[PDB]
Amino acid sequence: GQATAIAHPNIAFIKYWGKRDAVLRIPENGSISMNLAELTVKTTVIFEKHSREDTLILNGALADEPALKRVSHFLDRVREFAGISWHAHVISENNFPTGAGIASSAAAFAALALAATSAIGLHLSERDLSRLARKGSGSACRSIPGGFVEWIPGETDEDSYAVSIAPPEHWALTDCIAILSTQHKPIGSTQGMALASTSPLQPARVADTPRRLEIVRRAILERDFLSLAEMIEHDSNLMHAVMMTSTPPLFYWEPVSLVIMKSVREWRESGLPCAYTLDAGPNVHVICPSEYAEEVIFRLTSIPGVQTVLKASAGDSAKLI
Amino acid sequence: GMGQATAIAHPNIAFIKYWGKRDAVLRIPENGSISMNLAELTVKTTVIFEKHSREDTLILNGALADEPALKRVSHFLDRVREFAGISWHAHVISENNFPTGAGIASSAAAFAALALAATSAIGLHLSERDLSRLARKGSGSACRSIPGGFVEWIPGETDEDSYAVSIAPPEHWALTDCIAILSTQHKPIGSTQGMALASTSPLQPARVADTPRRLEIVRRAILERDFLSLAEMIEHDSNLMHAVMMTSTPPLFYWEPVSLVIMKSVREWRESGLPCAYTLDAGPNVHVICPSEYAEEVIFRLTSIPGVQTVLKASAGDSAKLI
Ligand SMILES: C[C@@](O)(CCOP(=O)(O)OP(=O)(O)O)CC(=O)O
Numbered sequence: 001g002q003a004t005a006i007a008h009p010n011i012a013f014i015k016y017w018g019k020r021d022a023v024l025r026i027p028e029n030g031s032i033s034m035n036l037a038e039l040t041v042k043t044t045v046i047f048e049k050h051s052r053e054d055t056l057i058l059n060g061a062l063a064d065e066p067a068l069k070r071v072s073h074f075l076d077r078v079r080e081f082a083g084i085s086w087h088a089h090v091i092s093e094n095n096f097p098t099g100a101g102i103a104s105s106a107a108a109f110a111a112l113a114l115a116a117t118s119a120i121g122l123h124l125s126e127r128d129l130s131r132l133a134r135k136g137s138g139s140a141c142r143s144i145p146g147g148f149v150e151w152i153p154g155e156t157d158e159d160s161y162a163v164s165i166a167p168p169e170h171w172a173l174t175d176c177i178a179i180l181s182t183q184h185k186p187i188g189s190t191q192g193m194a195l196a197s198t199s200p201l202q203p204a205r206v207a208d209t210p211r212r213l214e215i216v217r218r219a220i221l222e223r224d225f226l227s228l229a230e231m232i233e234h235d236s237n238l239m240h241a242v243m244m245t246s247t248p249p250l251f252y253w254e255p256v257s258l259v260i261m262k263s264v265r266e267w268r269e270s271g272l273p274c275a276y277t278l279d280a281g282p283n284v285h286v287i288c289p290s291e292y293a294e295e296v297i298f299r300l301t302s303i304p305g306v307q308t309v310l311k312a313s314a315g316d317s318a319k320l321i
Numbered sequence: 322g323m324g325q326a327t328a329i330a331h332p333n334i335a336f337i338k339y340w341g342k343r344d345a346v347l348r349i350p351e352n353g354s355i356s357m358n359l360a361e362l363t364v365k366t367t368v369i370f371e372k373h374s375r376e377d378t379l380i381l382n383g384a385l386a387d388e389p390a391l392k393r394v395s396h397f398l399d400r401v402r403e404f405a406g407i408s409w410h411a412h413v414i415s416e417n418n419f420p421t422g423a424g425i426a427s428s429a430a431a432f433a434a435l436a437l438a439a440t441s442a443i444g445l446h447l448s449e450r451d452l453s454r455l456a457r458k459g460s461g462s463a464c465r466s467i468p469g470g471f472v473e474w475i476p477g478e479t480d481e482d483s484y485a486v487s488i489a490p491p492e493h494w495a496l497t498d499c500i501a502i503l504s505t506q507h508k509p510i511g512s513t514q515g516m517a518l519a520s521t522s523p524l525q526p527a528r529v530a531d532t533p534r535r536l537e538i539v540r541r542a543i544l545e546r547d548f549l550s551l552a553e554m555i556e557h558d559s560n561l562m563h564a565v566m567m568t569s570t571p572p573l574f575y576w577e578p579v580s581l582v583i584m585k586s587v588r589e590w591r592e593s594g595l596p597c598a599y600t601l602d603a604g605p606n607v608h609v610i611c612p613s614e615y616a617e618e619v620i621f622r623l624t625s626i627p628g629v630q631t632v633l634k635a636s637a638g639d640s641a642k643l644i
């Protein structure tokens with residue numbers, strides 16, 4: 001059996017940081033994100049005759065050990081579930097600008113979940129596909145549904161999954177991603193959030209998340225940009241507050257990251273609707289209503305140290321092709 | 322000419338930070354703090370109670386003080402008036418040897434010196450603990466510049482419970498503060514207004530409740546001259562304060578880009594074997610603490626970082642003194 005699927009990465013408005021269960025990737029708190037339409041990972045899976053091990057090809061080129069074992073552990077779960085035991089070849093390609101530092105694990109494992117299961121015979125619901133991708137990478141469960149998506153955190157494998165809050169056409173928002181010229185290789189999200197419990201501030205951050213989800217959920221449903229802008233910056237800062245107060249500390253910000261954050265707030269306060277948010281790295285995602293995207297990109301491009309700015313709109317669910 | 326006295330005090334650098342007031346008027350803090358006085362920086366204040374003054378007068382480095390500064394100093398002198406049962410107004414002449422435009426806070430040294438000089442002029446004889454409580458009411462961190470050396474501010478929940486004591490004299494540990502002054506066209510939000518927002522941060526209660534653990538480690542590290550324990554805690558404590566600042570509503574981003582450069586460098590330097598650690602107050606300047614034998618190397622490395630205007634060098638100073 002063989003199948004091919006595509007999926008988009010997503011930008012979290014309310015962040016996932018810290019696991020309640022390491023192996024199942026049940027998060028400590030819920031999260032909300034938006035799919036990025038112009039960024040895509042395409043993956044084909046082919047289970048085979050008498051193959052005794054899986055093999056992974058990422059962008060025409062062969063994959064390294066860690067990436068393979070990740071993908072093979074994930075395919076093990078798809079085997080137990082389908083009652084089959086064939087191994088497979090996995091061919092994935094992404095249109096991500098090279099050296100941008102756009103994390104791919106969410107899109108990667110959302111496309112794998114959809115391609116692997118469908119190639120092996122199953123027809124999982126969106127909700128069960130979300131639960132499946134979650135076990136590859138937490139944030140992958142949010143790229144299974146389309147548009148603006150909420151991860152319901154839960155306390156069990158059955159209870160932790162994502163659902164669409166609103167389709168992409170509900171709100172014309174754009175994510176302008178400032179790629180930072182100078183950036184090295186920061187500690188990975190998995191390793192980084194495993195340290196969250198060393199932070200004196202993580203329990204309070206986690207306890208407070210329902211307040212933040214409720215504000216962002218309503219802001220998306222009501223198309224209330226100011227309420228969203230202030231909360232996504234607040235929420236980004238709460239995550240980075242925990243990172244910077246972990247032991248050892250995780251300082252994902254670059255100096256230019258600081259300039260952009262301060263500028264974005266200044267732009268909004270002087271009449272340009274926009275807001276920043278950052279993941280586990282120095283690039284800055286600037287969310288704005290799309291009418292303002294070209295003004296936001298202009299100002300961003302003018303900031304010394306900004307290598308380039310990518311433009312992205314709200315994307316759809318993962319899909320078989 | 323009813324009485325006259327002159328006192329000097331030093332500013333201090335907090336290893337465990339004061340951020341957030343429990344009581345705005347009394348300046349009782351939400352949490353305790355530990356600081357080291359800085360020997361090479363001084364505020365000298367003379368107070369002269371006059372029979373013919375109907376209002377106070379404040380001269381700073383030979384120039385009449387701005388209106389807000391006189392208000393601060395005049396309200397504080399009202400406290401002194403009340404605690405002495407005397408109504409004289411005063412001429413307050415003050416001078417300091419700070420580098421001009423460097424952004425180094427002088428409020429702790431200012432009100433420490435004023436507390437000592439004003440009470441001495443008006444004829445009182447206050448114990449160090451009571452002087453500490455008085456200076457606290459001008460500026461919280463001023464209560465830590467009354468005792469000498471390394472100083473702990475016991476936070477308390479009442480006016481009488483909130484005071485500072487010296488936990489070790491300056492000569493107990495040769496530590497140097499290499500202060501990196503950062504070029505900047507930005508006027509930061511003052512510490513008073515900034516920390517009034519601390520209750521808006523979701524993370525402030527957790528920061529506050531964790532303070533005794535942080536103070537225990539720093540208090541003992543000073544006794545033991547345990548620099549690595551001190552280093553890691555003061556960077557963690559600095560980061561916890563700025564975490565609350567940046568998660569306030571509206572947020573307070575006191576760091577400039579070069580502040581981040583220095584913070585990461587200092588961590589690299591210590592990890593490569595040069596003992597030193599950073600801590601930041603409510604502004605972009607970075608205080609780098611090191612055992613004094615490494616000061617010259619730390620200053621050398623700091624001075625070559627683009628955006629560092631200059632580097633000041635300070636050692637542990639003594640208590641506020643009547644001269
Ligand atoms: C910082 C983030 O981007 C988190 C990404 O976390 P991951 O999905 O990469 O973590 P794993 O479950 O270990 O794969 C914020 C977010 O997207 O919510």
Ligand SMILES: C[C@@](O)(CCOP(=O)(O)OP(=O)(O)O)CC(=O)O
Nearest residue numbers: 335338339460461462512513602603
């Ligand atoms: C950030 C700090 O330097 C605090 C300075 O606070 P202030 O003593 O200036 O506050 P007020 O009581 O309002 O005068 C950290 C510290 O010194 O502990």
